[PDB]
Amino acid sequence: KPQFPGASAEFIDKLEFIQPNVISGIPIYRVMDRQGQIINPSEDPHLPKEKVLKLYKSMTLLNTMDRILYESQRQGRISFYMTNYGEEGTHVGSAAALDNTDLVFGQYREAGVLMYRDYPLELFMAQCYGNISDLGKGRQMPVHYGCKERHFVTISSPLATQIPQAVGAAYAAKRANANRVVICYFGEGAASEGDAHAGFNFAATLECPIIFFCRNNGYAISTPTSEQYRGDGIAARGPGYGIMSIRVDGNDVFAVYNATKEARRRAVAENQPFLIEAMTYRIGDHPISRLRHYLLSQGWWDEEQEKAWRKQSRRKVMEAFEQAERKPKPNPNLLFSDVYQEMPAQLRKQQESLARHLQTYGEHYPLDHFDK
Amino acid sequence: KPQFPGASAEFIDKLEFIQPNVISGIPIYRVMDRQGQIINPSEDPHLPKEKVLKLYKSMTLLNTMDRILYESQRQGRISFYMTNYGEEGTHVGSAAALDNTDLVFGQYREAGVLMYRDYPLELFMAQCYGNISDLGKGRQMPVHYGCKERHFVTISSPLATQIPQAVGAAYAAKRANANRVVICYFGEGAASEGDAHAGFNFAATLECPIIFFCRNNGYAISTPTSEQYRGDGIAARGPGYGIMSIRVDGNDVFAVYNATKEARRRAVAENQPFLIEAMTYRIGDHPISRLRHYLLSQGWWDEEQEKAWRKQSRRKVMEAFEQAERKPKPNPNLLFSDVYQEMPAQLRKQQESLARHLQTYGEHYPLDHFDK
Amino acid sequence: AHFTFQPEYGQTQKMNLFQSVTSALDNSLAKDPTAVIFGEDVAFGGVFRCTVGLRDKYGKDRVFNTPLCEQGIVGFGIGIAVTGATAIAEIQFADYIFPAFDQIVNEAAKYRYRSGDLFNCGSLTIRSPWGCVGHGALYHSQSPEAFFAHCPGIKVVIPRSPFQAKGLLLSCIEDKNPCIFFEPKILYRAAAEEVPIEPYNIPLSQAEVIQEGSDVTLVAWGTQVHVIREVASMAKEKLGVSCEVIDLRTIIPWDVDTICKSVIKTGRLLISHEAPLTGGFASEISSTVQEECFLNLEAPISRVCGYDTPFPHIFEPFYIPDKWKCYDALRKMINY
Amino acid sequence: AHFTFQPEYGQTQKMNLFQSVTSALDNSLAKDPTAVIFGEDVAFGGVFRCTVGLRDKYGKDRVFNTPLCEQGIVGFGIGIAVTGATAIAEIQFADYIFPAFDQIVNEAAKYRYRSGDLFNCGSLTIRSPWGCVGHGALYHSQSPEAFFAHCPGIKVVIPRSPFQAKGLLLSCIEDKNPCIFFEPKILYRAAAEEVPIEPYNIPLSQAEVIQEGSDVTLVAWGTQVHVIREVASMAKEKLGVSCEVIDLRTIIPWDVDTICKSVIKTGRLLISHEAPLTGGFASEISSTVQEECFLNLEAPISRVCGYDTPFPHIFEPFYIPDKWKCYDALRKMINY
Ligand SMILES: Cc1ncc(C[n+]2csc(CCOP(=O)(O)OP(=O)(O)O)c2C)c(N)n1
Ligand SMILES: Cc1ncc(C[n+]2csc(CCOP(=O)(O)OP(=O)(O)O)c2C)c(N)n1
Ligand SMILES: [Cl-]
Ligand SMILES: [Cl-]
Ligand SMILES: [Cl-]
Ligand SMILES: [Cl-]
Ligand SMILES: [Cl-]
Ligand SMILES: [Cl-]
Ligand SMILES: [K+]
Ligand SMILES: [K+]
Ligand SMILES: [K+]
Ligand SMILES: [K+]
Ligand SMILES: [Mn+2]
Ligand SMILES: [Mn+2]
C-alpha cells in the first residue's frame, strides 16, 4: 500500500500508460430534440409559461439588436461589434437558472445575460455609441458592457482575465455567507490561457462556489479546435482539477437551464466549483427555432404572435438606436476621472493643460459632438 | 448523433455530472519492492551490471556532494543550496533511459542528470562558488547549473518557465528530423503555474516529442498538496490535454527507467508528448537503499565495496571542494558581457565608468579575490 | 485621420506596411530553412493579413497556429531559438503582450547572460501590431515600448513606413538577440511606397535624420514621426523655424549619439510619443540629453505625450499628442 | 554590508522591518473583518516571517496559502476586491511579480476607469520582498518599480525603515486604489527601531526630507536612502558640502512638488537607485525636474544607478550604486 502524500492510489506491477478517451467523449446532455419535444419527461424542468416566453423574447430581442448593430458597425457608425448568434440559448437559459443577485463575469458573448436581467436597450446602445448616457463614460470599445445594479462585471478585452477574478469574488461570497454563486463565462479558445488554469485550480483548492461556463463553438477566430487542444474538449479538463463537470447541448435552453440550476444548487451548498461546457455552433438547429417549436407544441405561441413580436421588437430596438445616435458624447473632462478614485494633482495639471489647449486650438477638435 | 466540431461524443438524456476519481487514483508503477526484489519478471529491464553500478555510484556521489555543499551553505561559504535527497533515483534512473544527446530542461532537483552524464565535480563546485572556472561566469545563484556539451539547459529561478521552452525545443527537433527527445523536469508545485498549462497544451496540439517529468514529493516549500490541487495529482491532468500519462514509484530506479525508456521510444517515433509523475518523499524506502539491496541480491556489491566507495567518493568531493574554494572569482569585466551577444556602446561606457572608479576607489572593493 | 503619410536595392514595388511585413517574412523563410512563423490565427494570413500566402508557400510545419496563450507563444518561441532555429512569433495586439512579460523579461532577455553564453535565444523575434488606430480604446491602442525599455538584453524596434518596416524587420530577424518589433497598425493599409522585392537591412540602434534643421530637434517613432514632420512644416510656415526631424527607430539600445549631436547643433529638443508621459521613453531621452548637452540647451526639453490615463475609446481625438499639441509646445519652447 | 541603518503615536516597541509588516497586517485584520491575506507559504508565517501568528489569531479562512501561481494570486485578489473585501496578496519575491504583469497593468490598474467607476479593485494591496540582498543574483534582487511606474491607475510604494513600513503599508491597505508595496528584504532582519503598536498612517505621494541642506539635493528610496544619508555625511566631512536628503517613498503618483522645491533651493540634484539606469525611475524625476527647475539648475542632474545588465551573483559588490559611486558623482557635480 503506497504511502505518498501527493496522491491516493494502489501499486501496479505492469507498465501501462493512461490513454485519453477523445473519440468517445463525455456525452452531450440534451432535454429536447430538434422538433422541441421533451425526450425524457423526468428531465422536463416544467418552467411556467411566462418564464419560457421571457426566455424566447429575450433571445429574439437580442437577435434583433444584433442585426441592427452589426449593420451599424459595417457602416462605421460604431467602431466594433460582436454578435450573439448561436449563443442566445446558452446565455438566456443559464441566466434564468441564476438568482438575480448572483455575480456574473464574462466577455464578448454574454449580452443575453444582461437582456434576461432587463438591461435597457438604451444602455446597450449608449455603450456602443459611447454617448452621455453610458455609465462607462464612453471609455471602452463597444460591447464592453457592465451593470452594477444587475451584478454583471464590466467586460474587458484581454481574454480569460476574468476567470481567476471570478474565483476571488466567489471566495469573498463564501466568507460573507451569502447564499450567492458567481458564474464565469468564457470560450474554448480563452480556456487555453494560463489564467484559466489559475482559475480552475484556485476554485477547487480554495473551495469556491463558482460555476465555470465554457462556450465551445469549435473556433477561436480562424483557429479550429484541432489546433486549440487535443483532449476531449474543456469538460474533460474539469476532473483533473477535482471539478464536477458536465457537457450540454447549447442549442437546448432547457439542457442549459437544468445544468446551471443544479450546478448553482450544489455550488452554493457545498462550496465547490462546477464546470459546464456548452456545445454551440459558430454562426457569426438554432436555440431560437428549437424553443419556438416547443412553444407551438404547448399552444403557447403562433404565427400571429411571432409576426407581432417581430414588429414590436424591431420598433423598440430602432427607437433606442435612433435616440442613441442623436445624443452627444460625454464631456472630454471624463477622459481624466476614475484613473484613480481621486484625481492626482499631476493628472489635474494634464486636464488643465487640455482645457487651455482647447481654448486656443478648439476649432480643430470635434467639440460640438461632446457635452458642454 | 451530435454534430459539434469541438468534441466527439454521443447524446445523453439524463443529467449526470462527471466526478473525479481521487480516492482511487492512477496506480503507482513499481518494479522492485523495498527489499530490492523484482516483483514481476516481465518488467525487469535486465540492465547490465556496469550500468546498474553506474546508477548506484552516481546517486551516492550526488548524496556525498550534497552533504558537503549543504554544510558549506550553512556556514555561508556559498550563498544558497538545494539538495537532491529523495530525488536521486528519479534523476539517475530517467537519465539512464535517455540518449546522451537528448536535451534536458529542469530546475533545482536535476543535478543527478548531470552527474549521470559525467559532469565534473569541479564544475558543480565552480558554479556554486562562482569562481573563474565557472562557464556561467559567476552570474547566477548556486545550483543554477548548465552544460552545452551535455545538453542540459541552464536552470533559472522562475518556476515553470522552462516548460513551454522545452516544448519549443521539441518542435524544432521534430523539424530537424533528429531522433531526439526533450525531457522537462518540474515539481508538483511548479505545475500550478500558467506556463505548465501552456506547455502541456502546446505539446499535444503541435505534436512534440517531449517527456514531461513531474516530481511529486507532496510539498512546495511549506505548502502541502492539499493546498496545491484537488484532482488526482498531476498524472490525472495529462489525459485532459490528450497526453499519455503514467505514475511511478520515484524510490524505484527501475520503475523510473522503464517508464522513461518507453516514453522516449514512443515520443520520438510518434511525435507525441508523454507525462510521467514520479512520487517521492520530501527529505530535504530511499532510492539508494533499495538499489543497494538489489545489488546485494545479485552479488554485485558488498560491505567492503560500500565502505571503500564511501571513502573514495568523499575524497573526490573534498578535492574538488578545496580547489573550488581556493580559486579566484572571475574578472569583474564579465559583469558586462553577454547581456547582448555584442556589447552595446552605452554598456561599454558603463564598463569604462567602473574601471575609472576602481582606479580611484579600488581599495574599498574586494579586488584581491577577483581575477586580474 | 490625425497623421498624413508621405514619400539602390534593385527592383521595387508598391507595398503598404502589411505587405512589406509579408515581403520580409517571405524573404526570411526563403533563405533560412530553420525559420518558422507562429501565433494566433497566423495560418490563414493573420487578422491584419501579414502572413497571407506564407503557409501555402512554405508548408504547415513552418507557418502555423498556436493555442490562444501568449505566455506559451513566447516560451515556445524561446525554446525553438535555444536550438538555433529562427522563431518569428506573433502577438496579436501589443496590448496582449503582457501575459508574456515574464517570459520576455525574466527569460528571453537574460538567457545569454545567465548561462555565460552556453545557451541563447538570439534567433527569436516577436512581432506585434502597436499604437493607436482612432477607435481601439484601452486594448487595441497601446504603445508598450517603455515597459520593455527597462529590460537589458532585449531590443525593441518600431518602423514608420513600409520601406523602413521591411528593412528593420529583416535586421531584427537576423540579429543575434531577442527582438520585439512593433508594427504601427494604423499604417498597415495606409499609403503604399516602393519597397525592394529582395531582402535588405536597415541597421538597429540607429536613428534617422529625415530632415535637417537648425533651430530645434524633434524626435519621435512610429506614426508619430509623420506628426512631427507635419509640425516641422507648420513651424517653418508660421514661425520661420527650422526643425531637425528624427526617427529614433530603435527604442533600445537607442542611438544616443545621433540625438545629442542634433541637440548640440539646435540647442532645443522636443520628444513626442503616444505612450503616457510618466515613465514613457521620452523621459530617458530627455534625462540623457540633459546629461550630455547641458551647456548647449537654450530651453527646457519638452515632452509631448499621451496623458497618464488608460487609452480612451470616445475621447481619442483629445488624448493623442497631435500636431497642434506638438506645435504649441514647440512655439512656447522657441519663445523661451 | 553596503549600507548602515540608523534612527506621538502612543506606546511603541522595538521592531525590525518584518515585525513591523506583521504589526501592520495584524492591526488591519483586527479592525477590518473583510480583510484576508494570501499567497504562497503565507500560512506558516511566510518565507520572510511577515505573517507569523496571523492564521492562528485570525483563522484559516483569513490567512491562507494559494497554489503556486502568481497570475492566479493577483487575479484572485482583484476578484476579492471587486466585492469590497480587503485583499492583501503576497508575491514571494518581486522578481516573480512578472507572471502577474497582465493582471496588474491591463486589469487592476484599469478596473475603475474602464467601468466608469461601476466596479473597482481599490481594496487590493500586493506586497512583495524587493531589492538587493548581497547574493540574490538575477532573481532574488530585482527592483521592478520602473516597470510599474509607466502604468496609470496603480500606486507603488517603498519604505526605508520599520516605522515607515508600517505607516506606509497601513496607508496602502486602506487606500482606495490597487497598491504595490515593495518591502526591502535586506532590511527585514537589519536593525530594529521603535514602532507604534497601534495603527497609524503615513501619507502616500509624499516624499520626506530627512535632512535639510543647501548645496545639493539627493533623492532615493528603500535601502538606498541609507546610502545617500551616508553620502551626505561624507560630502559634509570631506568637501564642506551641505546635502538635502530626500526619501521619495511613493514612486507613483510621486511627490513632484517636494523634489522641485528642494532643487529650486540647492540648484543641484543627484538621484540614486539600485534598478538599472535605462528606463529607471530616475529618468522620470530628472526629466521632470529639468522641466520645472531649468533656470535653477547649476549643473546637470546626475543619475547613479545599477548598470544596464541583469543583477549578478558574484559581481554584486561592483554592480550596486554604492556610497563611493554616489560620492564620486556628487563630487564631480559640485565641481561643475
Ligand atoms: C489575451 C488576448 N489575446 C488575443 C485576443 C484577440 N481575440 C479576441 S476574440 C479571440 C478568439 C476567442 O475565442 P473563444 O474564446 O473560443 O470565444 P468565441 O469568439 O469563439 O466566442 C481572440 C484570439 C484577446 N482579446 N485577448
Ligand atoms: C515564479 C516563482 N514563484 C516562486 C518561487 C519560489 N519557490 C522556489 S522553490 C518553490 C517551491 C517549488 O515546489 P515544487 O515545484 O513542488 O518543487 P520541490 O521544491 O518540491 O522539488 C517556490 C515557491 C520561484 N522560484 N518562482
Ligand atoms: Cl439593418
Ligand atoms: Cl479583441
Ligand atoms: Cl486640422
Ligand atoms: Cl561536512
Ligand atoms: Cl527560489
Ligand atoms: Cl568602506
Ligand atoms: K476579459
Ligand atoms: K525555471
Ligand atoms: K533576433
Ligand atoms: K489598496
Ligand atoms: Mn470559440
Ligand atoms: Mn514538490
PDB file of N, CA, C and O in Angstrom, chain C residues 240-285:
ATOM      1  N   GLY C 240       8.814  80.722 -39.162  1.00  0.00           N
ATOM      2  CA  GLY C 240      10.155  80.801 -39.707  1.00  0.00           C
ATOM      3  C   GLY C 240      11.174  79.949 -38.935  1.00  0.00           C
ATOM      4  O   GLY C 240      12.319  80.301 -38.906  1.00  0.00           O
ATOM      5  N   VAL C 241      10.747  78.831 -38.321  1.00  0.00           N
ATOM      6  CA  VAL C 241      11.590  77.977 -37.506  1.00  0.00           C
ATOM      7  C   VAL C 241      12.030  76.734 -38.316  1.00  0.00           C
ATOM      8  O   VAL C 241      11.224  76.021 -38.939  1.00  0.00           O
ATOM      9  N   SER C 242      13.331  76.502 -38.300  1.00  0.00           N
ATOM     10  CA  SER C 242      13.944  75.357 -38.939  1.00  0.00           C
ATOM     11  C   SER C 242      14.066  74.160 -37.974  1.00  0.00           C
ATOM     12  O   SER C 242      14.814  74.213 -36.975  1.00  0.00           O
ATOM     13  N   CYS C 243      13.359  73.081 -38.287  1.00  0.00           N
ATOM     14  CA  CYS C 243      13.277  71.886 -37.423  1.00  0.00           C
ATOM     15  C   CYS C 243      14.085  70.728 -37.993  1.00  0.00           C
ATOM     16  O   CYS C 243      13.975  70.412 -39.170  1.00  0.00           O
ATOM     17  N   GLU C 244      14.888  70.101 -37.148  1.00  0.00           N
ATOM     18  CA  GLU C 244      15.525  68.852 -37.461  1.00  0.00           C
ATOM     19  C   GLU C 244      14.642  67.696 -37.010  1.00  0.00           C
ATOM     20  O   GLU C 244      14.357  67.533 -35.783  1.00  0.00           O
ATOM     21  N   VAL C 245      14.173  66.909 -37.972  1.00  0.00           N
ATOM     22  CA  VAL C 245      13.207  65.824 -37.681  1.00  0.00           C
ATOM     23  C   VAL C 245      13.923  64.456 -37.668  1.00  0.00           C
ATOM     24  O   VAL C 245      14.580  64.074 -38.658  1.00  0.00           O
ATOM     25  N   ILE C 246      13.836  63.777 -36.519  1.00  0.00           N
ATOM     26  CA  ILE C 246      14.491  62.498 -36.290  1.00  0.00           C
ATOM     27  C   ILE C 246      13.528  61.379 -35.897  1.00  0.00           C
ATOM     28  O   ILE C 246      12.764  61.537 -34.961  1.00  0.00           O
ATOM     29  N   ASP C 247      13.624  60.267 -36.616  1.00  0.00           N
ATOM     30  CA  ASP C 247      13.016  58.986 -36.322  1.00  0.00           C
ATOM     31  C   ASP C 247      13.998  58.163 -35.515  1.00  0.00           C
ATOM     32  O   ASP C 247      15.030  57.724 -36.024  1.00  0.00           O
ATOM     33  N   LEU C 248      13.676  57.914 -34.253  1.00  0.00           N
ATOM     34  CA  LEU C 248      14.533  57.114 -33.404  1.00  0.00           C
ATOM     35  C   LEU C 248      14.746  55.682 -33.903  1.00  0.00           C
ATOM     36  O   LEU C 248      15.861  55.152 -33.808  1.00  0.00           O
ATOM     37  N   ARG C 249      13.658  55.062 -34.356  1.00  0.00           N
ATOM     38  CA  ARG C 249      13.638  53.689 -34.886  1.00  0.00           C
ATOM     39  C   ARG C 249      13.866  52.554 -33.831  1.00  0.00           C
ATOM     40  O   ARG C 249      12.985  51.751 -33.602  1.00  0.00           O
ATOM     41  N   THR C 250      15.051  52.485 -33.211  1.00  0.00           N
ATOM     42  CA  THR C 250      15.303  51.552 -32.134  1.00  0.00           C
ATOM     43  C   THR C 250      15.155  52.237 -30.785  1.00  0.00           C
ATOM     44  O   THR C 250      15.842  53.209 -30.498  1.00  0.00           O
ATOM     45  N   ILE C 251      14.215  51.726 -29.972  1.00  0.00           N
ATOM     46  CA  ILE C 251      13.997  52.174 -28.611  1.00  0.00           C
ATOM     47  C   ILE C 251      15.148  51.733 -27.681  1.00  0.00           C
ATOM     48  O   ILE C 251      15.676  52.575 -26.941  1.00  0.00           O
ATOM     49  N   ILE C 252      15.520  50.443 -27.688  1.00  0.00           N
ATOM     50  CA  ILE C 252      16.769  50.025 -27.017  1.00  0.00           C
ATOM     51  C   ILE C 252      17.466  48.955 -27.821  1.00  0.00           C
ATOM     52  O   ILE C 252      16.792  48.121 -28.454  1.00  0.00           O
ATOM     53  N   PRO C 253      18.805  48.972 -27.843  1.00  0.00           N
ATOM     54  CA  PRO C 253      19.652  50.083 -27.404  1.00  0.00           C
ATOM     55  C   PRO C 253      19.461  51.305 -28.283  1.00  0.00           C
ATOM     56  O   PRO C 253      19.506  51.139 -29.529  1.00  0.00           O
ATOM     57  N   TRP C 254      19.258  52.497 -27.719  1.00  0.00           N
ATOM     58  CA  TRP C 254      18.981  53.631 -28.609  1.00  0.00           C
ATOM     59  C   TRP C 254      20.208  54.422 -29.038  1.00  0.00           C
ATOM     60  O   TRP C 254      21.243  54.405 -28.386  1.00  0.00           O
ATOM     61  N   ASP C 255      20.018  55.164 -30.122  1.00  0.00           N
ATOM     62  CA  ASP C 255      21.081  55.946 -30.796  1.00  0.00           C
ATOM     63  C   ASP C 255      21.279  57.290 -30.117  1.00  0.00           C
ATOM     64  O   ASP C 255      20.897  58.347 -30.622  1.00  0.00           O
ATOM     65  N   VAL C 256      21.899  57.236 -28.942  1.00  0.00           N
ATOM     66  CA  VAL C 256      22.202  58.402 -28.136  1.00  0.00           C
ATOM     67  C   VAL C 256      23.042  59.432 -28.927  1.00  0.00           C
ATOM     68  O   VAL C 256      22.759  60.615 -28.895  1.00  0.00           O
ATOM     69  N   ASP C 257      24.037  58.975 -29.661  1.00  0.00           N
ATOM     70  CA  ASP C 257      24.919  59.926 -30.383  1.00  0.00           C
ATOM     71  C   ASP C 257      24.202  60.772 -31.418  1.00  0.00           C
ATOM     72  O   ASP C 257      24.456  61.935 -31.531  1.00  0.00           O
ATOM     73  N   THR C 258      23.318  60.201 -32.212  1.00  0.00           N
ATOM     74  CA  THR C 258      22.675  60.976 -33.270  1.00  0.00           C
ATOM     75  C   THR C 258      21.792  62.039 -32.633  1.00  0.00           C
ATOM     76  O   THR C 258      21.750  63.151 -33.102  1.00  0.00           O
ATOM     77  N   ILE C 259      21.123  61.722 -31.510  1.00  0.00           N
ATOM     78  CA  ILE C 259      20.220  62.671 -30.883  1.00  0.00           C
ATOM     79  C   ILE C 259      20.994  63.803 -30.217  1.00  0.00           C
ATOM     80  O   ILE C 259      20.653  64.993 -30.387  1.00  0.00           O
ATOM     81  N   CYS C 260      22.045  63.467 -29.486  1.00  0.00           N
ATOM     82  CA  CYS C 260      22.872  64.515 -28.858  1.00  0.00           C
ATOM     83  C   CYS C 260      23.575  65.399 -29.895  1.00  0.00           C
ATOM     84  O   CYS C 260      23.636  66.610 -29.748  1.00  0.00           O
ATOM     85  N   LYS C 261      24.085  64.808 -30.957  1.00  0.00           N
ATOM     86  CA  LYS C 261      24.737  65.599 -31.992  1.00  0.00           C
ATOM     87  C   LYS C 261      23.733  66.620 -32.569  1.00  0.00           C
ATOM     88  O   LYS C 261      24.067  67.758 -32.793  1.00  0.00           O
ATOM     89  N   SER C 262      22.462  66.240 -32.718  1.00  0.00           N
ATOM     90  CA  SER C 262      21.475  67.160 -33.245  1.00  0.00           C
ATOM     91  C   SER C 262      21.207  68.290 -32.258  1.00  0.00           C
ATOM     92  O   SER C 262      21.123  69.437 -32.668  1.00  0.00           O
ATOM     93  N   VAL C 263      21.087  67.960 -30.970  1.00  0.00           N
ATOM     94  CA  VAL C 263      20.756  68.939 -29.942  1.00  0.00           C
ATOM     95  C   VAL C 263      21.960  69.874 -29.658  1.00  0.00           C
ATOM     96  O   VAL C 263      21.767  71.021 -29.341  1.00  0.00           O
ATOM     97  N   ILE C 264      23.188  69.391 -29.804  1.00  0.00           N
ATOM     98  CA  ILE C 264      24.355  70.295 -29.702  1.00  0.00           C
ATOM     99  C   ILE C 264      24.232  71.362 -30.773  1.00  0.00           C
ATOM    100  O   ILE C 264      24.492  72.514 -30.500  1.00  0.00           O
ATOM    101  N   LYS C 265      23.805  70.979 -31.969  1.00  0.00           N
ATOM    102  CA  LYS C 265      23.569  71.941 -33.040  1.00  0.00           C
ATOM    103  C   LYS C 265      22.378  72.906 -32.814  1.00  0.00           C
ATOM    104  O   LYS C 265      22.531  74.121 -32.891  1.00  0.00           O
ATOM    105  N   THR C 266      21.194  72.381 -32.502  1.00  0.00           N
ATOM    106  CA  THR C 266      19.996  73.227 -32.402  1.00  0.00           C
ATOM    107  C   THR C 266      19.843  73.911 -31.070  1.00  0.00           C
ATOM    108  O   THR C 266      19.220  74.974 -31.002  1.00  0.00           O
ATOM    109  N   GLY C 267      20.308  73.252 -30.007  1.00  0.00           N
ATOM    110  CA  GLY C 267      20.104  73.712 -28.637  1.00  0.00           C
ATOM    111  C   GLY C 267      18.700  73.573 -28.045  1.00  0.00           C
ATOM    112  O   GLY C 267      18.474  74.024 -26.928  1.00  0.00           O
ATOM    113  N   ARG C 268      17.774  72.940 -28.775  1.00  0.00           N
ATOM    114  CA  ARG C 268      16.405  72.703 -28.303  1.00  0.00           C
ATOM    115  C   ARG C 268      15.885  71.302 -28.704  1.00  0.00           C
ATOM    116  O   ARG C 268      16.097  70.820 -29.797  1.00  0.00           O
ATOM    117  N   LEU C 269      15.123  70.695 -27.821  1.00  0.00           N
ATOM    118  CA  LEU C 269      14.620  69.359 -28.072  1.00  0.00           C
ATOM    119  C   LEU C 269      13.182  69.226 -27.637  1.00  0.00           C
ATOM    120  O   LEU C 269      12.798  69.642 -26.537  1.00  0.00           O
ATOM    121  N   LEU C 270      12.400  68.645 -28.523  1.00  0.00           N
ATOM    122  CA  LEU C 270      11.029  68.218 -28.248  1.00  0.00           C
ATOM    123  C   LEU C 270      10.896  66.739 -28.634  1.00  0.00           C
ATOM    124  O   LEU C 270      11.204  66.388 -29.761  1.00  0.00           O
ATOM    125  N   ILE C 271      10.499  65.882 -27.684  1.00  0.00           N
ATOM    126  CA  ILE C 271      10.272  64.443 -27.904  1.00  0.00           C
ATOM    127  C   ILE C 271       8.764  64.194 -27.783  1.00  0.00           C
ATOM    128  O   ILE C 271       8.115  64.734 -26.884  1.00  0.00           O
ATOM    129  N   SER C 272       8.231  63.383 -28.677  1.00  0.00           N
ATOM    130  CA  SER C 272       6.821  63.112 -28.704  1.00  0.00           C
ATOM    131  C   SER C 272       6.543  61.624 -28.830  1.00  0.00           C
ATOM    132  O   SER C 272       7.176  60.928 -29.592  1.00  0.00           O
ATOM    133  N   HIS C 273       5.565  61.143 -28.085  1.00  0.00           N
ATOM    134  CA  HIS C 273       5.113  59.768 -28.223  1.00  0.00           C
ATOM    135  C   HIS C 273       3.687  59.587 -27.721  1.00  0.00           C
ATOM    136  O   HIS C 273       3.200  60.301 -26.833  1.00  0.00           O
ATOM    137  N   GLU C 274       3.017  58.612 -28.315  1.00  0.00           N
ATOM    138  CA  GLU C 274       1.615  58.315 -27.997  1.00  0.00           C
ATOM    139  C   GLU C 274       1.476  57.755 -26.607  1.00  0.00           C
ATOM    140  O   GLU C 274       0.429  57.917 -26.006  1.00  0.00           O
ATOM    141  N   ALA C 275       2.524  57.067 -26.121  1.00  0.00           N
ATOM    142  CA  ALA C 275       2.506  56.401 -24.797  1.00  0.00           C
ATOM    143  C   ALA C 275       2.385  57.484 -23.713  1.00  0.00           C
ATOM    144  O   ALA C 275       2.804  58.613 -23.959  1.00  0.00           O
ATOM    145  N   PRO C 276       1.753  57.167 -22.588  1.00  0.00           N
ATOM    146  CA  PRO C 276       1.709  58.074 -21.437  1.00  0.00           C
ATOM    147  C   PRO C 276       3.059  58.714 -21.068  1.00  0.00           C
ATOM    148  O   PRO C 276       4.100  58.108 -21.128  1.00  0.00           O
ATOM    149  N   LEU C 277       3.000  59.978 -20.673  1.00  0.00           N
ATOM    150  CA  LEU C 277       4.177  60.722 -20.205  1.00  0.00           C
ATOM    151  C   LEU C 277       4.982  59.990 -19.124  1.00  0.00           C
ATOM    152  O   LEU C 277       6.192  59.748 -19.258  1.00  0.00           O
ATOM    153  N   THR C 278       4.324  59.626 -18.031  1.00  0.00           N
ATOM    154  CA  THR C 278       5.052  59.196 -16.855  1.00  0.00           C
ATOM    155  C   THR C 278       5.661  57.843 -17.116  1.00  0.00           C
ATOM    156  O   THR C 278       4.942  56.856 -17.434  1.00  0.00           O
ATOM    157  N   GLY C 279       7.001  57.789 -17.009  1.00  0.00           N
ATOM    158  CA  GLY C 279       7.712  56.529 -17.249  1.00  0.00           C
ATOM    159  C   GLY C 279       7.832  56.220 -18.723  1.00  0.00           C
ATOM    160  O   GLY C 279       8.357  55.183 -19.074  1.00  0.00           O
ATOM    161  N   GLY C 280       7.363  57.107 -19.606  1.00  0.00           N
ATOM    162  CA  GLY C 280       7.461  56.903 -21.056  1.00  0.00           C
ATOM    163  C   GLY C 280       8.904  57.036 -21.483  1.00  0.00           C
ATOM    164  O   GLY C 280       9.766  57.547 -20.747  1.00  0.00           O
ATOM    165  N   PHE C 281       9.199  56.614 -22.699  1.00  0.00           N
ATOM    166  CA  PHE C 281      10.572  56.576 -23.124  1.00  0.00           C
ATOM    167  C   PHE C 281      11.164  57.981 -23.387  1.00  0.00           C
ATOM    168  O   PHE C 281      12.360  58.145 -23.331  1.00  0.00           O
ATOM    169  N   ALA C 282      10.301  58.985 -23.566  1.00  0.00           N
ATOM    170  CA  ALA C 282      10.754  60.353 -23.657  1.00  0.00           C
ATOM    171  C   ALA C 282      11.552  60.824 -22.406  1.00  0.00           C
ATOM    172  O   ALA C 282      12.490  61.596 -22.560  1.00  0.00           O
ATOM    173  N   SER C 283      11.234  60.314 -21.224  1.00  0.00           N
ATOM    174  CA  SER C 283      11.980  60.656 -20.015  1.00  0.00           C
ATOM    175  C   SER C 283      13.401  60.157 -20.071  1.00  0.00           C
ATOM    176  O   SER C 283      14.286  60.856 -19.564  1.00  0.00           O
ATOM    177  N   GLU C 284      13.655  58.986 -20.688  1.00  0.00           N
ATOM    178  CA  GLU C 284      15.040  58.502 -20.814  1.00  0.00           C
ATOM    179  C   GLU C 284      15.811  59.353 -21.789  1.00  0.00           C
ATOM    180  O   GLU C 284      16.952  59.727 -21.526  1.00  0.00           O
ATOM    181  N   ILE C 285      15.186  59.711 -22.903  1.00  0.00           N
ATOM    182  CA  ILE C 285      15.872  60.585 -23.857  1.00  0.00           C
ATOM    183  C   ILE C 285      16.190  61.971 -23.287  1.00  0.00           C
ATOM    184  O   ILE C 285      17.310  62.455 -23.397  1.00  0.00           O
TER     185      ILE C 285
END
